[PDB]
């Protein structure tokens, strides 16, 4: 899509109607806090109602125009579809959909855990598609934005996270193809793919402990950079400690291959 | 070393989606090389004709097992049956896909899930089922993917998601096999448009571009797998093959590798 | 280098004091005309005194704030130095230094032509450094810009232009290094290196005839893109017919290596 | 077309080799390795006295023969005459190692046109003159030209503007003639050596009080240059860090050189 040739300003999110998934902790929670500070209307989701309630409490205090939570599992495609319709009724519409949740994952060699591969695909990928289908009519009304939280493991291969990597690679293939479809069918809904390096979330620090030794970037800045990129309608956001990653990760050969086919 | 057809002589090979298109051409090349072949697809009628032709071409043996890769039990039992019939397995060629059309994504989640189950998940189930036999022979896994599995194209969103998932999964396990000394090679084949009857029906006339020969495509997949190459590139244009390579990805992968204990 | 984060508007060049070398023909001539239409002050140079006179008169006609010529050969380092002093005296300062001239060159296999190697180095490179040195005190006063016209042959190897390719590569090495120096020593003079593919100029079309067969980009658009990048204080300008070159020619690995 | 074989010191046995800037640093180390390999060696630099000591050590090391010719590479007549005499001394030429540079310090560029001109003359123009004079003997032997460059000849660094310009010019000239030779079937290889900081006495004095990075050993450096030269490799990379080697490669330039070639 066409990005906004503008600098980011917090006023851009004031009164905006935002959904944040997997917002009970880590990056999702930090995104909900930044959005609350900007005076946005926020609807947060995850499975734990107790942690989600704590997130909403802080959001209301930070100055959100409104803040609500709806608890449930993204393993359940009916909840996924119903969540969006409910989130839209609470805010009276939708401007931005931030898809960020993932199924529980640990660092382990792949052996025979087909059920983890399937669950990663359903939760990390399939539910995102279901949420997008549910949200698209409201997003078309507001010329909104879809923000997809991915990973460096969704752009390059990593040992010990095969199922996870597969699900993140699937997000790129699906959302990048539909971005091209939206360009041709003149659908004014932006799609931002966020390619993240290791972030200092509670889950990440526990998961890589004693296995991986590398710099973890701050979650607060990470969340803000995701919100900025989505607000500016950027196609991709890259955020990592090294940079290095930042400038090596871009793929101009892919861009030429995609442009040269945007003529056949 | 250069490829020699004798590398496949007497080799025990599975080819999925082999009743037509690229898969069928692969069974034929393997048959001419004197390999033991087990082919699969849902249609027994078409598989019967592939098997009789494989025998005419000089296959050491050729048999079919019919079933749907939507069924994970079939996928698991298929590998056990094929391997028990040939007395082992040297090479697993994963090529089947669910029926696909060029269409703008239109709330068809069922097609996204089916594409993920057939084009991606069943490949994992087949690999898990085949791994003990492939470890015994220091065998090979050949994963047929697409240019739409490396770059974004409109009208094949579900298909593209499934092909991208193959890269993430198989490229990740390849790193794991390298560090855990699993002597089973993994080859990802990135194909441009191929002149299969299915591709020609689906693309003409929404798109205008040169389709590469299916016979030569099939041979190049076999060569790459036999040579244990990580990735095989095949397109009408040599310029496309130059653009598929991602050296930055390879640097990042090596850099991130050193963080692991 | 901090580029101006605004879109290009021709008003950016109104009343600006601009030198254009190699301005008697091709891209240099086209640059003088664009700047004239934008209402800039122009001082054009090359050897052809009669052609420069015709260029200056057409510049005044297009709406240049002033137009003057100083004729001479950039083989002569004394001339190069005095040309800048004299050009700066005519305009009452200097805002943009556009280094575009090159020695006459053809496509030939290199065998033993040391003369052509030395001449390309002296004219296409050394004179650019002499002009920059002479221009710097004025550019420092105006927070001005140095625009270096290079080539794709200044970024990648091409057979048949070995001497020319050496001089263009030397430009990248010299100017990108001084750009790093200006940022650390806080010298607010911008440096734009322009990487061009084949352009439809008369000299180029005659030189590549029957030797090289490929699309040539228009000289008028090329000239404009050079001025835009310079005005916007961009580090590098890429201009070529194929949108393969433009995004493949960037070097992120070089950027990492430089980040120190 | 590089040699599809492992390097062996025996590849240099009885080879006729010129090493410029061989009185000290990397050049001296290259002369010593070649001597240990039993090559015939002709060394040059300005230092008559230290060149005699280098030569005597080369003989002690087992060189087939060793001679020196002293002079300045600022003098193009000396450069031309040196090659002719080196060729007579050895009875031909198999390898031309171009390594000398004019005196260089780390300094901000101000108005030092003399240093720019001298760097261009010595570090670049004398290499071309030496190549031209050597070519008939190199064509007779299917020989090799080895050009010692630098990271400052691939990327921009402050404080070395004149030097960097001269090293970039070696890349443009020698890489263009390499394309010419391959298409006109001239069986003379051209090796461009891209070096990171090396622990020579001159480098260590010049960086003291400025940058603080690990300098690689001069003896391993010298050998790596000879190996790349003997193997007919287009480029040799040598640095203290393996990460530098990965970053020096320019696959986009290699792609572009290929598409531009088809138009000839
Ligand atoms: N942290 C990092 O280093 C990196 C993170 N990322 C990406 O950033 C995003 C967030 O990362 P991070 O904050 O570390 O993740 P966390 O593990 O901290 O949180 C994941 C969130 O998803 C929720 N969730 C888990 N299972 C389900 C389910 N079945 N249904 C619905 N929601 C569920 C969790 O809440 P609850 O369990 O209560 O449901 C929680 O709110 C992810 O998309 C991840 O891939 C990318 C690269 C690196
Ligand atoms: N042709 C092209 O242009 C390109 C092809 N490719 C890839 O190459 C491979 C083959 O392509 P192509 O030959 O054109 O494909 P075809 O459509 O010709 O054949 C697909 C094969 O899969 C079988 N199949 C279909 N559905 C199922 C199912 N549910 N369970 C099991 N098998 C099934 C089919 O047989 P049956 O229906 O009887 O089951 C058939 O044998 C695929 O992986 C594709 O993505 C990649 C890029 C371009
Ligand atoms: N055209 C193309 O395809 C490409 C062009 N370029 C670059 O663009 C720039 C201009 O190209 P182009 O317009 O094609 O070249 P032209 O040959 O058309 O013009 C070159 C100019 O330099 C002048 N000049 C020549 N010799 C001298 C000298 N000794 N002293 C002073 N001035 C001299 C000429 O004027 P006079 O003879 O009167 O002195 C003329 O005005 C150059 O830097 C070139 O390398 C880069 C890539 C491709
Ligand atoms: N050392 C490093 O960190 C790096 C070195 N390099 C490259 O490696 C090469 C050697 O570097 P290094 O060994 O460090 O340098 P040194 O300064 O140690 O030696 C350079 C040699 O050139 C000779 N020389 C100097 N002036 C002239 C002249 N006018 N005519 C002829 N010979 C001359 C010197 O001998 P005498 O004074 O007797 O004439 C000396 O033998 C150079 O090409 C350099 O650019 C590249 C990257 C980093
Ligand atoms: C040059 C220097 C400075 C030394 N660099 C070193 C390399 N580098 C880098 C490389 C890789 C990574 N990641 C990002 C991808 N990835 C990931 O998304 N993991 C996530 C993360 C942890 C765990 C698995 C997975 C889901 C988690 C969850 N919440 O359930 C649990 C959160 C990943 C996986 C395993 C190891 C590392 C990573 N981040 C940064 C840049 C910095
Ligand atoms: C740079 C230059 C040289 C100018 N090139 C431009 C042209 N180019 C190119 C682009 C795209 C393509 N393909 C390959 C991927 N892809 C694909 O896998 N399709 C398949 C194919 C057709 C249909 C969808 C899908 C499954 C099919 C089945 N059997 O069910 C049915 C078989 C695809 C999709 C739609 C159109 C084209 C393609 N091939 C080549 C390469 C680069
Ligand atoms: C296949 C398609 C898609 C058609 N592409 C092909 C590849 N491509 C491309 C490649 C190369 C080039 N150049 C640019 C460098 N270069 C150059 O600067 N030449 C210049 C030019 C001509 C001559 C030598 C030199 C000085 C000249 C003068 N004024 O004295 C006289 C002006 C050059 C040299 C010889 C041949 C080509 C070129 N331009 C475009 C983009 C398009
Ligand atoms: C990304 C990571 C992995 C972290 N690395 C960052 C750091 N790095 C690096 C950077 C720069 C350098 N050099 C090489 C170029 N260069 C050089 O050629 N110098 C030479 C050297 C010194 C002096 C100038 C010049 C001629 C000298 C002579 N003999 O007259 C006198 C000898 C140079 C200059 C000053 C400082 C350093 C260097 N070497 C390594 C490698 C990559």
- Where residue D16 sits, what CATH number does that domain have? 3.40.50.720
Element (H, E) at D262: none
- Measure the CA–CA gap between A220 and D56, rounded to whole angstroms: 67
Q: Residue A151: name the closest of A195, A100, A103, A99 by CA.
A: A195
CB count, 10 Å around CB of D132?
18
* Residue A155: C-alpha distances to residues A7, A132, A195, D113, D152 (Å): 27, 21, 8, 48, 32
Considering only CB atoms, B168 lies closest to which of A111, A159, A168, namely A168
* Farthest CA pair distance, chain C: 50
Q: What values do phi and psi take at D235, rounded to 5? A: -140, 145
In Å, how far from its chain's centre is CA C173? 15
- Enumerate neighbours of C (3 or more CB pairs within 8 A): A, D
- Measure the CA–CA gap between C88 and C65, rounded to whole angstroms: 15
**B255 has a chain D CB within 8 A of its CB:** yes
Q: What values do phi and psi take at A41, rounded to 5? A: -90, 130
Considering only CB atoms, D176 lies closest to which of C158, C248, C251, namely C158
Classify D87 as helix, strand or coil. helix
Active-site residue, from C69, C128, C158, C164: C164
**B207 has a chain A CB within 8 A of its CB:** yes
**Chain A residues in contact with B72 (beta carbon < 8 A):** 114
Pick from C3, C240, C252, C253 the residue to mutate for testing the A interface (most A CBs within 10 Å): C252
- Tell me if A165 and B163 make a contact (CB, 8 A cut-off): no
CA angle C66–C72–C78, rounded 5-degree value: 105
Q: Is B198 in the pocket of ligand 6 (CB under 6 A)?
A: yes
What range defines the domain where residue C191 resides? 1-260
Q: Counting Cβ atoms within 10 Å, is residue C193 exposed (0-12), middle (13-18) or buried (19+)?
A: buried
Where would I find the H helices in A75-161? 77-91, 114-120, 127-142
Q: Which residues contact D141 (CB under 8 A, 6 or more apart)?
A: D16, D92, D93, D94
Question: What's the token pair of residue A187?
Answer: 């659908």
Assess contact for B169 and A158: CB atoms under 8 A: no
**A185 has a chain B CB within 8 A of its CB:** yes
Q: Counting Cβ atoms within 10 Å, is residue A6 exposed (0-12), middle (13-18) or buried (19+)?
A: exposed
Q: Residue B252: name the closest of D238, A158, A208 by CA.
A: A158
Q: Residue B113: name the closest of A81, A174, A46 by CA.
A: A174
Q: Which residues contact B193 (CB under 8 A, 6 or more apart)?
A: B147, B199, B203, B209, B210, B211, B212, B235, B236
Question: What's the token pair of residue C159?
Answer: 């057979």
Assess contact for A160 and B253: CB atoms under 8 A: no
CA distance C248 to chain A (A): 6
**Chain D residues in contact with C168 (beta carbon < 8 A):** 172
Assess contact for B59 and B193: CB atoms under 8 A: no
Q: Is A75 in the pocket of ligand 1 (CB under 6 A)?
A: yes
**B147 has a chain A CB within 8 A of its CB:** yes
Assess contact for A134 and A84: CB atoms under 8 A: yes
Active-site residue, from B159, B177, B233, B260: B159
Query: Is D28 assigned to a binding site?
Result: yes
CA distance D21 to chain C (A): 21
Q: Is D150 in the pocket of ligand 8 (CB under 6 A)?
A: yes
CA dihedral D254→D255→D256→D259, nearest 10 degrees, is 120
CB count, 10 Å around CB of B45?
8
**B254 has a chain D CB within 8 A of its CB:** yes
Strand order in the sheet with B61-64: B61-64, B36-39, B12-15, B91-94, B140-144, B185-191, B231-234
The total domain count for chain C is 1
* Residue B116: C-alpha distances to residues A124, A166, D106 (Å): 13, 11, 59
DSSP state of D217: P
**Chain B residues in contact with D243 (beta carbon < 8 A):** 255
Q: Which residues contact A263 (CB under 8 A, 6 or more apart)?
A: none
Q: Is A101 in the pocket of ligand 1 (CB under 6 A)?
A: yes
- Enumerate neighbours of A (3 or more CB pairs within 8 A): B, C
Element (H, E) at A147: strand A145-149
CA dihedral D256→D258→D263→D264, nearest 10 degrees, is 120
Classify D186 as helix, strand or coil. coil
- Measure the CA–CA gap between A84 and A137, rounded to whole angstroms: 11
**Which residues of A are annotated as catalytic?**
164
DSSP state of A18: E
**Chain A residues in contact with B175 (beta carbon < 8 A):** 157-159
Cα of first residue to Cα of last residue in chain D, in angstroms, is 20
* Residue C141: C-alpha distances to residues A96, C189, C192, C234 (Å): 49, 9, 18, 20
Nearest CA to ligand 7 atom 32: C204
**CA of C148 relative to ligand 7 center, distance in Å:** 17
**D108 has a chain B CB within 8 A of its CB:** no
Q: Is B77 in the pocket of ligand 6 (CB under 6 A)?
A: no
Q: What values do phi and psi take at D196, rounded to 5? A: -85, -175
Question: What's the token pair of residue D204?
Answer: 């260590």
Q: Residue A253: name the closest of B30, D203, D13, C244 by CA.
A: C244
Query: How were these coordinates obtained?
Result: X-ray
CB count, 10 Å around CB of A217?
18
Question: What's the token pair of residue B99?
Answer: 């029926």
**CA of B193 relative to ligand 2 center, distance in Å:** 13
Ordered DSSP codes for chain C: -----S---GGGGTT-EEEESS-SSHHHHHHHHHHHHTT-EEEEEES-HHHHHHHHHHHHHHT-SEEEEEE--TT-HHHHHHHHHHHHHHHTS-SEEEE-----------SS-HHHHHHHIIIIIIHHHHHHHHHHHHHHHHT-EEEEE--GGGTS--TT-HHHHHHHHHHHHHHHHHHHHHHHTT---EEEEEEE--B--HHHHHHHTTT-----B-HHHHHHHHHHHHHTT-SEEEE-SSTTHHHHS--HHHHHHH--
Query: Is B69 assigned to a binding site?
Result: yes
CA angle A161–A163–A165, rounded 5-degree value: 60
Size of interface A-C (CB pairs under 8 A): 19
In Å, how far from its chain's centre is CA B161? 16
- Which long-range contacts link A110-113 to residues 24+ away (Cβ below 8 Å)? A110/A162, A110/A163, A110/B172, A110/B173, A110/B176, A111/B128, A112/B128, A113/A163
* Residue D154: C-alpha distances to residues C182, D221, D247 (Å): 20, 18, 11
- Measure the CA–CA gap between B48 and B63, rounded to whole angstroms: 8
Q: Is B30 in the pocket of ligand 6 (CB under 6 A)?
A: no
Task: Count each helix (H run) and each strand (E run) in chain D, helices first.
Answer: 10, 7
- Measure the CA–CA gap between C50 and C185, rounded to whole angstroms: 43
- Measure the CA–CA gap between C190 and C143, rounded to whole angstroms: 8
**What residues form DSSP beta bridges with A37?**
none
Nearest CA to ligand 8 atom 20: D203
CA distance D13 to chain C (A): 30
- In angstroms and rounded to an integer, the radius of gyration of the C-alpha atoms of chain B is 18
Where would I find the H helices in D110-241? 113-119, 126-141, 161-183, 201-207, 218-230
Element (H, E) at A51: helix A49-62
- Measure the CA–CA gap between A238 and A152, rounded to whole angstroms: 9
* Residue C231: C-alpha distances to residues A87, C41, C148, C239 (Å): 49, 14, 13, 16
* Residue B225: C-alpha distances to residues B93, B142, B178, B215, B222 (Å): 9, 6, 16, 16, 5
Query: Is C43 assigned to a binding site?
Result: yes
Q: Is D203 in the pocket of ligand 8 (CB under 6 A)?
A: yes
DSSP state of B109: H
Considering only CB atoms, D263 lies closest to which of C77, C177, C214, namely C214
Assess contact for B163 and B98: CB atoms under 8 A: no
For a mutational test of ligand 4's pocket, the pick from D18, D19, D20, D21, i.e. the residue with the most ligand atoms closer than 8 A to its C-beta, is D21
**CA of D259 relative to ligand 8 center, distance in Å:** 33
Q: Is A259 in the pocket of ligand 6 (CB under 6 A)?
A: no
Active-site annotation holds for B159: yes
- Enumerate neighbours of D (3 or more CB pairs within 8 A): B, C
Checking phi first, is residue B51 left (phi over 0); if not, alpha (psi -120 to 50) or beta? alpha
**Chain B residues in contact with A240 (beta carbon < 8 A):** none
Q: Residue B143: name the closest of B224, B215, B74 by CA.
A: B224
Place of tokens 């180390």: D29
């Amino acid at each position: 899509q066409q990005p906004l040739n503008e600098e980011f300003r917090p006023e851009m999110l004031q009164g905006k109607k935002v959904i944040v998934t997997g917002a009970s902790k880590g990056i999702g929670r930090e995104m909900a806090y930044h959005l609350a500070k900007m005076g946005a209307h926020v609807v947060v989701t995850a499975r734990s109602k107790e942690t989600l309630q704590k997130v909403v409490s802080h959001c209301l205090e930070l100055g959100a125009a409104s803040a609500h939570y709806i608890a449930g599992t993204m393993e359940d495609m009916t909840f996924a579809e119903q969540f969006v319709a409910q989130a839209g009724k609470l805010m009276g519409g939708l401007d931005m959909l931030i898809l960020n949740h993932i199924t529980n994952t640990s660092l382990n060699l792949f052996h025979d855990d087909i059920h983890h591969v399937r669950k990663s695909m359903e939760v990390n990928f399939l539910s995102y598609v279901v949420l997008t289908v549910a949200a698209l009519p409201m997003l078309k009304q507001s010329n909104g934005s879809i923000v997809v939280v991915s990973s460096l493991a969704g752009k390059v291969a990593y040992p010990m996270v095969a199922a996870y990597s597969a699900s993140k690679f699937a997000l790129d293939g699906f959302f990048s193809s539909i971005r091209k479809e939206y360009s041709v069918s003149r659908v004014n809904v932006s799609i931002t793919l966020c390619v993240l390096g290791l972030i200092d979330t509670e889950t990440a620090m526990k998961a890589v402990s004693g296995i991986v030794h590398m710099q973890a970037a701050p979650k607060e800045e990470c969340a803000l950079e995701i919100i900025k990129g989505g607000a500016l309608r950027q196609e991709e956001v890259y955020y990592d400690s090294s940079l290095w990653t930042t400038l090596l990760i871009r793929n101009p050969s892919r861009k030429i291959l995609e442009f040269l086919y945007s003529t056949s």
